[PDB]
Design a protein around this ligand. Structure first.
Ligand SMILES: OC[C@H](Cc1cccs1)Nc1ncnc2[nH]ccc12
Ligand SMILES: [Cl-]
Length: 167
């Protein structure tokens, strides 16, 4: 039993809700919140910009030190950093950004990072400003993640479409 509330159950392990991931994380304080990161951990817009703003830019400061030490992530890769005031940990995951011409096949590799954590609050990878089809992202999530994932979907029209189209 966990403290996630109001989710629709899609499979044994995948749940979904129309919610602002920032407001969700503040309420639940999950062990892991997933950020929709880029390889530079430049948290400018989308989920990343929103999460960073909620940390008063502390996420960006920590991220800049991470990059200075380690260099950029790989597309499809991840790193674990602090969750600041939002969660214990933030798993920064880089899905392919279609608006940069990145291979959508790397979306499965991106979701594989979730399997290293028993429970996660997450957005749909490569959705939103990353340009991929969110219905496809949900399908890859369900077919790749085996741990317990609570998906927050920002856009209401998208949430209803994802549920009503889910197979
Ligand atoms: O798949 C990630 C989605 C993409 C979108 C499609 C339409 C509108 S946003 N973004 C988010 N999902 C959940 N919480 C969020 N908080 C801020 C942004 C955000
Ligand atoms: Cl977005």
């Amino acid at each position: 039993v966990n403290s996630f509330s109001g989710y629709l159950k899609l499979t044994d392990n995948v749940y979904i809700k129309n919610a602002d991931i920032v407001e969700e994380a503040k309420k639940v304080k999950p062990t892991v919140v997933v950020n929709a990161a880029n390889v530079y951990l430049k948290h400018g817009g989308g989920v990343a910009g929103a999460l960073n703003k909620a940390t008063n830019n502390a996420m960006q400061v920590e991220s800049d030190d991470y990059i200075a030490t380690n260099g950029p992530l790989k597309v499809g890769g991840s790193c674990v950093l602090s969750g600041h005031n939002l969660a214990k940990h933030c798993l920064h995951v880089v899905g392919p950004n279609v608006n940069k011409g990145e291979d959508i096949q790397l979306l499965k590799s991106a979701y594989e990072n979730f399997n290293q954590h028993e429970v996660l609050l997450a957005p749909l990878l490569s959705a939103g400003i990353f340009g991929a089809d969110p219905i496809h992202s949900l399908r890859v999530c369900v077919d790749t993640v085996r741990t317990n994932v609570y998906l927050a979907v920002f856009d209401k029209n998208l949430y209803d479409k994802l549920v009503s189209s889910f197979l």
